[PDB]
Every structure is written in C-alpha cells, then in structure tokens.
Write a protein that binds this ligand. Structure first.
Ligand code: MYA
Lengths: 8, 393
C-alpha cells in the first residue's frame, strides 16, 4: 500500500 | 524535504542515500548484480540513538504492545498529499503482515522514549524469496518505517534504516525490497494507484473524489452501480483444500513478470487463506471440480482527518489475481462486486502486472502520486509497471 492516493 | 516526482528528485541532494549501496538517481544500469560484496563481519552493537531514546524489539504477541504499534501507525503513518487521509492498519492486519513464515522478533524494530516508554519509532523486516530477472535471492521486505510527528526531521529515519540493515546482515541476508511514495535512489519500477468508486456519495462528501466536469450526483451513482452478485460460475471463498492449487496457479502465473515473490506452500497459506477484515481470496471451481482462477484483495481502511461525521474510509486493495480459464476482466468485475457486497467504499489497484488491461474498462480513475519499487544492494535495469509482479501491504 504505502503510498496514499486519490483520483487525480 | 521529500520528492514525489522524478525530475524534482534530480534537483535534490541525498545525504543519506549517497552513503548506501544503491545506484545513483542519474545512473543508468546495464548490469545485473550486487552493488557491493556480502560483508563477512557485521557490527555487533546497535547504532546509537539521540539522547533519551532506546531500542526495543516489539513482541506483537503481547496484545498491549501490538496496540501501541497500532496507535503509533494510526497517528503517524502515511498520509495522502493533501493531509486528509491516513492509513489505519488494524492490529490483526499488522499481525498478518509482520508475522509471516520466517518472521524474527528482532526484525520488529521499535524506538521508545526512555522516560515515558512511549513508542515513537518503528521499522520492520520480513523474509521473502525474490525473483528479479534471471536471479532468485533470499531478501527481506522492509515496511512500516514510521517516526512520530514530534520527532520528525531529526535524522532518526536513517538510524532506523541502518539498524534494521545491521540486524538483517546478522542473519546473512544482503538484499532488500521495499516500496515508497517518495522518489529515492533508485526506483527499479514506478507504479500508479488507480481507484474504483464503490460508494461514490461517501467518497464525494469526504473529498476523496469529486464530480467530474458536467456529471451530476445522480449520474455518477448510476455510472458506478454494480450487480449484487458476481457473474463467474463456481466462484467461492478459498478453503484449506485449495492451498496447493492456489500455490501452483500463482507460481506458474508469476513467471511472466520480472519482479515477483517465490512463495512456499506455507507462505501461500499465510498470504491468501481468508481472514475476515484482513484478506479475501475467492477461487473459481469449475464444472469438473478444478480450481482454475483466483482473485484476492486485502482490507486497509484510512482515517478521515478532521471530519465531524465521516471518520473512516473502508478501502479494498487488489492483491494477486490469477487467471487461466476466466478472463481477467470478468475476474476483476467479480472482485468489485464482492468488495461492494462486503461494505467497501473504494477498490484500489496498481497498474502493475496485467492490470492496465482492465483499469479503464472497469471505470477505475487514475490516482495522484506514484508507488516506487526499490531494491537494496542489487543492480539491474528498471522495468515497466506491467513487468512488476510484486504486491506489498
Ligand atoms: C540488507 C537489508 C537492508 C534493509 C534496509 C533496506 C532499505 C530500507 C529503506 C526504507 C524502506 C521504507 C519502506 C516504507 O516503510 S514506506 C513508508 C514510509 N513511512 C511514512 O511515510 C510514514 C510517515 N512518515 C514518517 O514517519 C517519516 O516522515 C519518515 C520515517 C518516512 C522519514 O522520517 P523524517 O521525515 O523524520 O526524515 P529524517 O529527517 O529522519 O531523515 C531524512 C532522510 O530519510 C530519507 N527518507 C525520507 N523518507 C524515506 C523513506 N520513506 N524511505 C527511506 N528514506 C526516506 C530522506 O530522503 C533523507 O535521506 P536523504 O534525502 O538525506 O538521503
């Protein structure tokens, strides 16, 4: 997981 | 001063990472092998911490100690770029991730305040056999590096990295693999998270996502609606009897990628045998009774920071998905349905392996920020995302 993302 | 993009890290000086056996960010690698020889004598003493802090290995078998680590991560671990969401790994999840077969107590490396005993730092290693191009090596996976927010920017992270390196060297292992959202010397591959809305209304109210230009809330909800039951014949939860064939399917499927784990049958049991609110695995048992495919995803919610009504986002993460008779598209479609059923708000997947063949088609939206993959003390050419076949927690 490690990287927190959200829709660009 | 971290760096999230590849040319923005080119303008940075890597005081710590320049001392480490990893290729340079500008370097281009046309070779395969260790950066440096295995060391045949290893420092016996732990690296010194700043005054007032002490090493402590965490017995995660002690419920109280596990809760302290949960709280440290819950309050201080990875946030998104906007400081709106933070990972919320559960205690039972952490046990799954940190005690796979071969785990060692000294590889659960904590830092405490001498006076208060407060847990303020952590790093971990777990063993893993790693296939990288034509080489198979016993390595460790490094995860959960965390420094309390009040202790940040005090060069504590380099001490945690050196100390876990030492404790791993002591066991005769000289390579590691790890992932990070920041750019460091030097990524072997760069992946990107995509997201699939499951409860779009929740996601828009918490500003995880937004209404796309010229699309209303009613259209967006209709656009993301899913069947209530999966489509694939004979899909069912993985059971104990499925462990050997799941091992077989995964082993054969992973050979086509260039960075993969090599799991024993015991490791397959650990990583895939379903645990509620941790890991889900569904197999396809066909009309002859043969298991021909499986899908899996793990449970990782996030805290929604500073919100009066919504406190947590329930996220599902694509794990390993193996197909030999069912189309991948249909497999992932059923994964979305199963996740929706189980109450998840969003379904996350990386663009590695063959995932790009379904991401757009199943209405995933690209995320922001990358997930970089790294090897420690191993030189080899970088690879495209579709050749990465390793998923870490
Ligand atoms: C043989 C076996 C070997 C085993 C070891 C293999 C290598 C393992 C490597 C680690 C595998 C991690 C895998 C995961 O767990 S990825 C998860 C990372 N964790 C988080 O993002 C949680 C939230 N953040 C924090 O807790 C802190 O900000 C951390 C602890 C990340 C940095 O703390 P702080 O903000 O207080 O920084 P500092 O002042 O102490 O020190 C700054 C120095 O540290 C470099 N830095 C910053 N972030 C990272 C990072 N994520 N990996 C490696 N290095 C990082 C930075 O570039 C600089 O070096 P340089 O720029 O001067 O060169």
């Amino acid at each position: 997981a490690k990287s927190f993302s959200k829709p660009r | 001063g971290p760096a999230k993009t590849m040319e923005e890290a080119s303008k940075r000086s890597y005081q710590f990472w320049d001392t480490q056996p990893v290729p340079k960010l500008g370097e281009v690698v046309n070779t395969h092998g260790p950066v440096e020889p295995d060391k045949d004598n290893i420092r016996q003493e732990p690296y010194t911490l700043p005054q007032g802090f002490t090493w402590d290995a965490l017995d995660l078998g002690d419920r109280g100690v596990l809760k302290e680590l949960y709280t440290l991560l819950n309050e201080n671990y990875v946030e998104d770029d906007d400081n709106m969401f933070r990972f919320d790994y559960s205690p039972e999840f952490l046990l799954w991730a940190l005690r796979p077969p071969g785990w060692l107590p000294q590889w659960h490396c904590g830092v405490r305040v001498v006076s208060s005993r407060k847990l303020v730092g952590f790093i971990s290693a777990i063993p893993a056999n790693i296939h990288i191009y034509d080489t198979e090596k016993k390595m460790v996976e490094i995860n959960f590096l965390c420094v309390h927010k009040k202790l940040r920017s005090k060069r504590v992270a380099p001490v945690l990295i050196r100390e876990i390196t030492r404790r791993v060297h002591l066991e005769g292992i000289f390579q590691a693999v790890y992932t990070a959202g920041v750019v460091l010397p030097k990524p072997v591959g760069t992946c990107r998270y995509w997201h699939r809305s499951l409860n779009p209304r929740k996601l828009i109210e918490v500003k995880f996502s937004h209404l796309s230009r010229n699309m209303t809330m009613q259209r967006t909800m209709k656009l993301y609606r899913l069947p209530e039951t999966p489509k694939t014949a004979g899909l069912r939860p993985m059971e104990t009897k499925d462990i050997p064939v799941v091992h077989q399917l995964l082993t054969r499927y992973l050979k086509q990628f260039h960075l993969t784990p090599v799991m024993s049958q015991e490791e397959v049991e650990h990583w895939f045998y379903p645990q509620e609110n941790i890991i889900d695995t569904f197999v396809v048992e066909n009309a002859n009774g043969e298991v021909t495919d499986f899908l899996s995803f793990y449970t990782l919610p996030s805290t929604i920071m500073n919100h009066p009504t919504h406190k947590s986002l329930k996220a599902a993460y694509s794990f390993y998905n193996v197909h030999t008779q069912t189309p991948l598209l249909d497999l992932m479609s059923d994964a979305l349905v199963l996740a929706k059923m189980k109450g998840f708000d969003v379904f996350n997947a990386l663009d590695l392996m063959e995932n790009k063949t379904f991401l757009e088609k199943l209405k995933f939206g690209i995320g922001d920020g990358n997930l970089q993959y790294y090897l420690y003390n191993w030189k080899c050419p970088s690879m495209g995302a579709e050749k990465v076949g390793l998923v870490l927690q």
